[PDB]
Amino acid sequence: AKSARASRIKENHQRFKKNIAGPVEAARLERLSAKLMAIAQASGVKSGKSIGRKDSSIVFPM
Amino acid sequence: KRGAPGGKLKMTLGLPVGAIMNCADNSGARNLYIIAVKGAGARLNRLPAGGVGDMVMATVKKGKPELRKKVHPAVIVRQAKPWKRFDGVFLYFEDNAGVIVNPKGEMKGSAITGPVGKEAAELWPRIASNAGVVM
Amino acid sequence: MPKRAVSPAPSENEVDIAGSLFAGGFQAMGLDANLLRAIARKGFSVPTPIQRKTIPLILERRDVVGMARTGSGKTAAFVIPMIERLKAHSARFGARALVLSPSRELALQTLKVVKELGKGTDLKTVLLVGGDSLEEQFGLMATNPDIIIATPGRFLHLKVEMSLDLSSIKYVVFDEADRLFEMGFAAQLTEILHALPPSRQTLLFSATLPSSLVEFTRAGLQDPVLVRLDAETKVSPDLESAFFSVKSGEKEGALLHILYDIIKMPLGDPPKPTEHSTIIFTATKHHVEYISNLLRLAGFSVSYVYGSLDQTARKIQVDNFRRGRTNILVVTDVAARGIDIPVLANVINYDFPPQPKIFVHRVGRTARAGQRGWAYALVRESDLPYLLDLQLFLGRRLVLGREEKDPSFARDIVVGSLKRVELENNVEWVNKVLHENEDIGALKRVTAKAEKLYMKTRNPASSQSAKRAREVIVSKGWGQLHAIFGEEAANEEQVRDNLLSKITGYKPQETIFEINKAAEAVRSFRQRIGPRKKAPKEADKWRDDYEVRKKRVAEAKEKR
Amino acid sequence: GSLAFLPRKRAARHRGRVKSFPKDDPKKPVHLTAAMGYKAGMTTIVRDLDRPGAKAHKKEVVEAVTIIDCPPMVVVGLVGYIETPRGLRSLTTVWAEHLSDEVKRRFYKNWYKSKKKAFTKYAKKYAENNGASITRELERIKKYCTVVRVLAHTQIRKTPLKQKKAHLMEIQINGGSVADKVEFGRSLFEKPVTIDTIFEKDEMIDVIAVTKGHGFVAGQMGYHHRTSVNHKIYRIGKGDDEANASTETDLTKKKITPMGGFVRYGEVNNDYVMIKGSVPGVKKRIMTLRKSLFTHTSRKALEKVELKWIDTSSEFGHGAFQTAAEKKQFMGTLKKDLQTS
Amino acid sequence: TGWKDIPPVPTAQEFIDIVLSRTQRRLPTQIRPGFKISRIRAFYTRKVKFTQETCSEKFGAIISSFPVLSDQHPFHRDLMNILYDADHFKVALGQISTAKNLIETISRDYVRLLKYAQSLYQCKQLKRAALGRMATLIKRLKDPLIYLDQVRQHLARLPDINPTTRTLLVAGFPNVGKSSFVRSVTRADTPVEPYAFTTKSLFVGHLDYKYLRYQVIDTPGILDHPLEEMNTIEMQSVTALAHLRAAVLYFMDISEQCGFSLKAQINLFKSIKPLFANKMVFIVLNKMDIKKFEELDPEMQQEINDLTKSGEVEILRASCATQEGVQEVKNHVCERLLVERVSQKLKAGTHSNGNIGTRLQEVMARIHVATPMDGTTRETFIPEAVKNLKKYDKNDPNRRVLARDIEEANGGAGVFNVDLRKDWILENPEWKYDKIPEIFDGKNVYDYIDPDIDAKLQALEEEEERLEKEGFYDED
Amino acid sequence: AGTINKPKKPTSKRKTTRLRAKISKRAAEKKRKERKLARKNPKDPGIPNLFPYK
RNA sequence: CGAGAUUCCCACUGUCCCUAUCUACUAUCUAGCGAAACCACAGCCAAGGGAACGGGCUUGGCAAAAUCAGCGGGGAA
RNA sequence: GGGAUAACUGGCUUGUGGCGGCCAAGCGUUCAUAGCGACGUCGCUUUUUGGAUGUCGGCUCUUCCUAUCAUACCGAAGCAGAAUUCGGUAAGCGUUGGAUUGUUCACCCACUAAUAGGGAACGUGGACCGUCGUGAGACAGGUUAGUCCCUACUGAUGAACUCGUCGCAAUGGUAAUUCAGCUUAGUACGAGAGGAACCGCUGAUUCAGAUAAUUGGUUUUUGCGGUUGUCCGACCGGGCAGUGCCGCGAAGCUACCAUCUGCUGGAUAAUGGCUGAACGCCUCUAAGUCAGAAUCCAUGCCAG
Numbered sequence A: 001a002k003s004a005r006a007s008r009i010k011e012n013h014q015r016f017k018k019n020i021a022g023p024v025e026a027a028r029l030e031r032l033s034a035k036l037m038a039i040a041q042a043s044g045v046k047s048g049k050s051i052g053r054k055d056s057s058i059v060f061p062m
Numbered sequence B: 001k002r003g004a005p006g007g008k009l010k011m012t013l014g015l016p017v018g019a020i021m022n023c024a025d026n027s028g029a030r031n032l033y034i035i036a037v038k039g040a041g042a043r044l045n046r047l048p049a050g051g052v053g054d055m056v057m058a059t060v061k062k063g064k065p066e067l068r069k070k071v072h073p074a075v076i077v078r079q080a081k082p083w084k085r086f087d088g089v090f091l092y093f094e095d096n097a098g099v100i101v102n103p104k105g106e107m108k109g110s111a112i113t114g115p116v117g118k119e120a121a122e123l124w125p126r127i128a129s130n131a132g133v134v135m
Numbered sequence C: 001m002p003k004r005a006v007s008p009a010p011s012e013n014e015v016d017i018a019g020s021l022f023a024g025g026f027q028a029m030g031l032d033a034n035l036l037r038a039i040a041r042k043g044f045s046v047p048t049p050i051q052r053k054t055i056p057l058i059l060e061r062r063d064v065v066g067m068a069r070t071g072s073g074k075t076a077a078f079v080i081p082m083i084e085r086l087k088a089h090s091a092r093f094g095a096r097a098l099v100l101s102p103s104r105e106l107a108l109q110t111l112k113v114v115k116e117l118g119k120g121t122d123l124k125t126v127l128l129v130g131g132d133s134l135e136e137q138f139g140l141m142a143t144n145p146d147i148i149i150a151t152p153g154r155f156l157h158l159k160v161e162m163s164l165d166l167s168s169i170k171y172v173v174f175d176e177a178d179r180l181f182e183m184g185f186a187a188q189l190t191e192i193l194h195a196l197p198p199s200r201q202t203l204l205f206s207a208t209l210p211s212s213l214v215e216f217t218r219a220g221l222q223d224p225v226l227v228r229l230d231a232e233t234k235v236s237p238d239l240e241s242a243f244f245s246v247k248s249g250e251k252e253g254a255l256l257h258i259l260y261d262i263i264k265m266p267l268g269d270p271p272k273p274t275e276h277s278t279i280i281f282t283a284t285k286h287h288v289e290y291i292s293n294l295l296r297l298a299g300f301s302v303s304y305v306y307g308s309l310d311q312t313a314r315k316i317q318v319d320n321f322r323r324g325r326t327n328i329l330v331v332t333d334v335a336a337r338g339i340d341i342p343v344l345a346n347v348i349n350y351d352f353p354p355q356p357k358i359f360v361h362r363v364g365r366t367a368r369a370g371q372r373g374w375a376y377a378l379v380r381e382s383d384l385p386y387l388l389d390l391q392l393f394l395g396r397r398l399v400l401g402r403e404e405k406d407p408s409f410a411r412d413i414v415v416g417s418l419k420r421v422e423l424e425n426n427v428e429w430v431n432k433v434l435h436e437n438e439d440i441g442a443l444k445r446v447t448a449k450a451e452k453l454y455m456k457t458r459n460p461a462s463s464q465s466a467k468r469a470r471e472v473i474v475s476k477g478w479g480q481l482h483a484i485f486g487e488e489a490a491n492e493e494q495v496r497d498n499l500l501s502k503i504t505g506y507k508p509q510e511t512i513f514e515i516n517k518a519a520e521a522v523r524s525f526r527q528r529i530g531p532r533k534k535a536p537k538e539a540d541k542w543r544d545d546y547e548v549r550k551k552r553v554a555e556a557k558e559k560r
Numbered sequence D: 001g002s003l004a005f006l007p008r009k010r011a012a013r014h015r016g017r018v019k020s021f022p023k024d025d026p027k028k029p030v031h032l033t034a035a036m037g038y039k040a041g042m043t044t045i046v047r048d049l050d051r052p053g054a055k056a057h058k059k060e061v062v063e064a065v066t067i068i069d070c071p072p073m074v075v076v077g078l079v080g081y082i083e084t085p086r087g088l089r090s091l092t093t094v095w096a097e098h099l100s101d102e103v104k105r106r107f108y109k110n111w112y113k114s115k116k117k118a119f120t121k122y123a124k125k126y127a128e129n130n131g132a133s134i135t136r137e138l139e140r141i142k143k144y145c146t147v148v149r150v151l152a153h154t155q156i157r158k159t160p161l162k163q164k165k166a167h168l169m170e171i172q173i174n175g176g177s178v179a180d181k182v183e184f185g186r187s188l189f190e191k192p193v194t195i196d197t198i199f200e201k202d203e204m205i206d207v208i209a210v211t212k213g214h215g216f217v218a219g220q221m222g223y224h225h226r227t228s229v230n231h232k233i234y235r236i237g238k239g240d241d242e243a244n245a246s247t248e249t250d251l252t253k254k255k256i257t258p259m260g261g262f263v264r265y266g267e268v269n270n271d272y273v274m275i276k277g278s279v280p281g282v283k284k285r286i287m288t289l290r291k292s293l294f295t296h297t298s299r300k301a302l303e304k305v306e307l308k309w310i311d312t313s314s315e316f317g318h319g320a321f322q323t324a325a326e327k328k329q330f331m332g333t334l335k336k337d338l339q340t341s
Numbered sequence E: 001t002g003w004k005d006i007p008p009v010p011t012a013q014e015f016i017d018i019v020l021s022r023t024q025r026r027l028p029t030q031i032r033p034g035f036k037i038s039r040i041r042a043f044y045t046r047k048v049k050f051t052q053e054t055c056s057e058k059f060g061a062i063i064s065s066f067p068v069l070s071d072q073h074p075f076h077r078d079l080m081n082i083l084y085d086a087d088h089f090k091v092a093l094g095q096i097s098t099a100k101n102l103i104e105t106i107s108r109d110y111v112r113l114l115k116y117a118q119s120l121y122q123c124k125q126l127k128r129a130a131l132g133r134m135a136t137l138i139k140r141l142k143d144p145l146i147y148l149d150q151v152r153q154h155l156a157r158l159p160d161i162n163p164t165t166r167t168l169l170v171a172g173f174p175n176v177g178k179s180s181f182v183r184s185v186t187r188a189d190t191p192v193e194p195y196a197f198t199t200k201s202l203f204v205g206h207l208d209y210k211y212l213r214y215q216v217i218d219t220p221g222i223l224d225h226p227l228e229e230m231n232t233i234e235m236q237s238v239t240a241l242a243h244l245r246a247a248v249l250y251f252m253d254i255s256e257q258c259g260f261s262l263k264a265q266i267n268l269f270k271s272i273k274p275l276f277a278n279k280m281v282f283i284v285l286n287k288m289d290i291k292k293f294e295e296l297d298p299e300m301q302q303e304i305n306d307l308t309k310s311g312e313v314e315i316l317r318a319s320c321a322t323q324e325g326v327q328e329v330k331n332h333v334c335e336r337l338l339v340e341r342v343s344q345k346l347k348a349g350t351h352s353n354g355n356i357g358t359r360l361q362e363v364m365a366r367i368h369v370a371t372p373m374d375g376t377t378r379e380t381f382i383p384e385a386v387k388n389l390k391k392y393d394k395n396d397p398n399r400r401v402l403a404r405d406i407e408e409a410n411g412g413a414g415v416f417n418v419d420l421r422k423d424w425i426l427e428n429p430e431w432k433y434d435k436i437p438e439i440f441d442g443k444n445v446y447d448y449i450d451p452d453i454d455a456k457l458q459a460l461e462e463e464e465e466r467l468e469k470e471g472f473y474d475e476d
Numbered sequence F: 001a002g003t004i005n006k007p008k009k010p011t012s013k014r015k016t017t018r019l020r021a022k023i024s025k026r027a028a029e030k031k032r033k034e035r036k037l038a039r040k041n042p043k044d045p046g047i048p049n050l051f052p053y054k
Numbered sequence G: 001c002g003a004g005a006u007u008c009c010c011a012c013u014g015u016c017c018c019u020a021u022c023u024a025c026u027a028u029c030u031a032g033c034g035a036a037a038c039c040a041c042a043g044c045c046a047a048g049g050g051a052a053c054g055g056g057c058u059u060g061g062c063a064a065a066a067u068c069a070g071c072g073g074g075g076a077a
Numbered sequence H: 001g002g003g004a005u006a007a008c009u010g011g012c013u014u015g016u017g018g019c020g021g022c023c024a025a026g027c028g029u030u031c032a033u034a035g036c037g038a039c040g041u042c043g044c045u046u047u048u049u050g051g052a053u054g055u056c057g058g059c060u061c062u063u064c065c066u067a068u069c070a071u072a073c074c075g076a077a078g079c080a081g082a083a084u085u086c087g088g089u090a091a092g093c094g095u096u097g098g099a100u101u102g103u104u105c106a107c108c109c110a111c112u113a114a115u116a117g118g119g120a121a122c123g124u125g126g127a128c129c130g131u132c133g134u135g136a137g138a139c140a141g142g143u144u145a146g147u148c149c150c151u152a153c154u155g156a157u158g159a160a161c162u163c164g165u166c167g168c169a170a171u172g173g174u175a176a177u178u179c180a181g182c183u184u185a186g187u188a189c190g191a192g193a194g195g196a197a198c199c200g201c202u203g204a205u206u207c208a209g210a211u212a213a214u215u216g217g218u219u220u221u222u223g224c225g226g227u228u229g230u231c232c233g234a235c236c237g238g239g240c241a242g243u244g245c246c247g248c249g250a251a252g253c254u255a256c257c258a259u260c261u262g263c264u265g266g267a268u269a270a271u272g273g274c275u276g277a278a279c280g281c282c283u284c285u286a287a288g289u290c291a292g293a294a295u296c297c298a299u300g301c302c303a304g
């Protein structure tokens, strides 16, 4: 019997992944993301748009 | 092809090697002696066990003088050990019974006495043909 | 799994008449009045030659080795003088007579003979066989019998368990010693021989004398006298013989041809032997089963008796044959020496015997009391050297094919080939059966493997037998028709086969490859071969037969 | 035993770590990768098999299925990870205001004797127009981070357990750009997420739990972190329907909970996931459901399931009465009930 | 069944290389001087014994597998003899036995020598010497291996006939048209190239004739030599003609286009006549289209009729080019062969005695036809539809849909899911694809299905109304 | 061969003093044996052609 | 209750295992009391260490306190 | 009785015999003839008809090697097909019996994909003192010789680094194996007999990790029902039979006696190629490069 890691079995599994389970999982995740979105919608420094500082074993002590 | 049934679901095998089961067909044998189960795996210290629908080597220890002490293949038809069926039904038989069969599938006898398992009947067509009671 | 699990159950029947190197009514033999009355009640009016020759020696107290077939009266032969010597029960503790037999059935037969021939006497006889209660055997030994009939293993086990003293035994009988040695009882037989006191009279009754048995008798018997069944080796002049050179692939068909035309056997169940009485002797039990099934398919009334067959089955088969419900009896060698075979009219040996003396026994199985008998042999190219050993042993002139117009089939060993047309038709039908029914094919394969093993395990022939076997194969008579097929046949086949003989004697000029390195090797090879110049369960209230079962339990408790 | 699972180690954490999430590509739409529930128990179902080429095709098949009580989970945080030559590392996390009492019990160990001060200054920072700092953290996550996880907690106060401490876990957001997934999480803050939202019907997943410790009769045997792969959700029940165990074949209005309630668990009133086969862990234990790392390679997945009924006889005994109605009807009237009436 | 299942045999150098490879690779190979002398001798004697065992098993397989010449049917023995000189084959397969036996003799000899060996170098040189003896023995056996390989190859590529079964041989001079006839009558490829000895080996085909198998054999051909001197091809031809119990057809042509005079065919056939006297023989005048049976000379006609005079010969006309009469001639000859076979089968079982064989009883039981004594025939139900529908033909383009084609379009064996709903027939079509309730409130809906249940419910409601009037639920 | 992915047992180049001493003694014995055989007992090439001034 | 009708088992062993019964042997913790053998100094592993001599030494692999329970490695004829 | 060696091997071991002749490049006493001298061939073993084994073992377990029985891969073969044989890449995987025997192998037969070989300090559980004899020996005469410590490892804990939550992953281990059935297909092939493979689908063996929905089993739940004998004069309730026995029995624990699950990318070896020099032809190789094994390396998994 061919091993579970055989090249032929891997190629057939990849073909199955790209041709059969692909669209099914795509539509599944599409409706899932749709329901996710349904539930979800259901001065620079002074405003915080500019990223600033909050609040060393890489460099030798100086 | 080696004498191993193809297309059989898992079940609780209840007939070990060396088992005295009673005979089913009208060949003349009174009992069959399970001595070797065809298709069993190779595990040390593990006694090969057989279930309904498996051809098992059998030896007539008690029977008509013509057929006594004779080794031929035989397939299990009835097992008293409880086994479950894919409809979720646990069932078991009164006795342990098998019908003498040649390695192709022609049964030496002509009529099968008593009931017959669905597993044996489905795996072997002529057992269904010459079996008068299958449940 | 159990296909030749241990060994072919019928191994061989080896005989050694070199054991010969060891050295008219009951009222005339003067037995006691009570013994004479018992014999008359049993119905023994005229003694058979075996006891006629042995009983005076046993009364003279000489050790005896008796070559006798089953059924000749060996049991009576060794029990009558034993009773005549005993004459009474002894008040002193200790057994006086011991008989050792292979199987419980033979032990029971001997026990019945002893009881019937000793009706009236106060002799205590015991049976010690396997399967009986050891406590019961202890009680019997406590009751102190004078005569013991037992199997070697059970007797040794009882002796070891009870520390029995055998010094009081003066009479020892070994029934079926060749069977004892074939079953392998030799070790405990020697142990019992060592345990027995030297001052004893030993009788050993056997149908065959193997070399191991001869050595055992030489080591354990004091000046044994060998008595034999008269002219058991002298081939009867009323025996007609024909031998057929047959190939393995056509050999079953040849057997069918002999059954159909040479004997003209009727087909079906027959409407004390019969007029035909066809017995066939083979090599292996697998051959026995194969030939039996093939012949019942062909339509014969066949009974088969092989070595390791169940006791009841073999009795039923032998009863059917002896009462004439079957016409063919298929046996190898072991069941043959075992069972009682009546007078036969046709004997055919499928597999040629290794030993000329085995052949002599198998052909003396027929043509008895002045009656004419027929014997047909199936001989192959590999079996020819044994046929040549046989012709040396018998001292008969060899007639190959049709070298003589009217050969004497009784005094001359006549070998020939069978008729080609019917041979081929039977071969075709055999092939059709083999292709059609799978059971026969499996039997063919297993009997072929058994025949291969028998070829490896068969005793070899002599160098000179192999030699003139080669020259016989070279000779023309090997392929010629048998003398039984007719002078008109001789005419047609002589008109034809001569150019066919030229065809068969073709020396090709060059092989088809000669017609590369392989071709060069073939040419050089050619130049090299260039010719040289129990209580019931407790009653349950809910159970229907509650009160009845309670009553049963109470009754069992009262019985205790 | 197998060398990949020895030496036998205790599970360091009772919850169970996810370790690996499915690989991310930007092309898919946004979605969470994980969810949590609690193993309530198992029942029996019979199914019209739709496996072509099988011996039992188009026949009644009886199977054992685990029930996982799955109350809605609450989003309380976002985290931003950065990819580094030393692996992924937590760059920065943002919390939510009005954090629940139960998630605070998770943050604490001795809750009864501690004055509730955790995250108070953080809520103050939200409240006092440090939205500058808030947007700074969110912009940092959007600009520098490649992987974002949503902190979500499951709610014992709805689960039927004597526990009162919530359960927290990080759940990756895949299928989109970093800005898109950060905006999605920001919307997600302070909103319950259902299992209808996270997972869906008749699909193959992976389940993480800690297999039971067989204690008190060469060492630790039991209590092992196990992620069993390839288990198929057949059903999602709603709680509020009250026809959850009800199937189209039998119009018997009952919940998934058999007669007398689940043994040693109780009775479930929430969303639940019914999955095929035996599943690691025991009752009352947290069960971590996640998506498969790879696209499936069998018809067992993308095989659509049609159910017949669910065993609702009392598992505390060998009962055979699915509903109290049919039981009280079949047994008739009893003397104690008659005297009460 | 044939002789193809014969294992290949190697050359001398090959067999040496593989045997020594086994004895090198399959056993332990390292030994040390510090080890015990007993273990050293055990090691070396194990090496010697393994070499003996592999050589013996290979030679035993070779001999026991090659065919045993003088146990086969005379056709087979003489055919393999003419192809391959039997005496020379036998002396080869001899040398190989004697060589193996000498191998075992050397084996015991060096086993005793190693058992009494006293040093590591002793065992060294003893093992080397023994293996050298076997190597030299095979080196001398170099040529028999080549010869036996060649005979193995041909005996594998040898046609397998059944001498017993119904057979029809086609013989004659070369170029008459034997190969053309056999290609016409059966599906066997025989070179039809027009030169003298086109076929150098026997060719075999098969046909069916009212549900019965016949085997046709084409033989190469025979010239005017008086069988004392022959080519091997003509010898295998005559051996087939002499040992194959079968119908015999002798193909001759009126036109001397084959290159032999009509008198030459007549002399050849009278020469081979005794070989065919027992049989049924059929002379076939081929190429009648180019040269018919009428126009040749009257004394030629007279001599061929004098040949016809005998009672086991027959004359037929044929033209294999246009297949004018091949069907008729094969039908007729095989019919007479079948009749003769039936006669022989009847005699086998009708043999003198008065009791019929069990097989014959069975064949009467089979052939017996049962018929009711009343002589009435039951009326039958055959519908006009299946009377006038069209026969099912696979090549036909305008075809039915077929479940197989639906399956292949929608997947395969394990892919396509069959739908019984399309096959459902119902009064209201949209009834289909609807779930059917089975259990409800713990009682079986199917078990409680019953027509007129409306009327029964009305009766029950009347009964309950009577009970309510009776006050059948009041408390006192 | 798969020596690249699965290396085998290394052959040590660290010579042992015992082996070195044995080699030295045996080579000395070889020199003595050559001398013994030589004592036991029992053509100019010319100027090269390619030389320019031969 | 039916002479009611029909089906299964019973053997021995100088053979192995289990279960049943008899005799004998077996028991933990905390307090209190409390020895002896033995002890040049201490014990990670690999290769080398001429003299089948390693725990010293050389070159490396490395190397993190302290307990309880299992476990395996060393100590001429 | 004296003398001598304390003892063996340690780049040892394997697959191809020896003796003689012929031939033989070279070297040699001075030159192929003082002579040495490989590969081959010839003559002998060796040709004209087809049982050996003494003490031992027996089982299990770990690890390792390959000199590979099978699984995977290819090169060759009258290899039509099927079934095969030889060769090599390959140690991930697995590698069962009976007969027979003192006992092993050979051979023999039964399963089975297959029953391959080995290593692990050959891995863990008597001789004189004599006395009586010298054509050979004996001696119930003696002297008598004769062994509980350390630590690695694992699990569970663990001091300080303020406590707690959520994480990262260096490192170490690493797991899946084989067979079967449907379709292809009674097709390709084939005179017949017979008779494939790819794709796709469904099962089964072994191993591994789990679980008790359902089915057997177990009852200090001593739960419910029954029941034996005893004594306390009797009721009573008790001691009673180191928990009396018999039926059913929950929960729990279980079961090769039940159910579930076991996963994907890259680089390679034999080999097959592309382009094209060495070498004006040619070439898979030298530069560059493609595919390719159950191989290797990582993900998936476990520890942290």
Ligand SMILES: Nc1nc2c(ncn2[C@@H]2O[C@H](COP(=O)(O)OP(=O)(O)OP(=O)(O)O)[C@@H](O)[C@H]2O)c(=O)[nH]1
Pocket (backbone or CB within 6 Å): E173, E174, E175, E176, E177, E178, E179, E180, E181, E191, E192, E193, E194, E195, E196, E197, E198, E199, E286, E287, E288, E290, E318, E319, E320, E321, E322
């Ligand atoms: N015109 C005609 N020619 C025929 C006929 N039969 C055979 N032939 C000729 O035969 C030639 C080929 O020889 P085959 O058919 O093989 O005859 P053969 O008897 O088998 O002899 P070989 O050729 O040696 O095999 C063809 O070229 C034809 O010309 C026929 O019926 N009519």
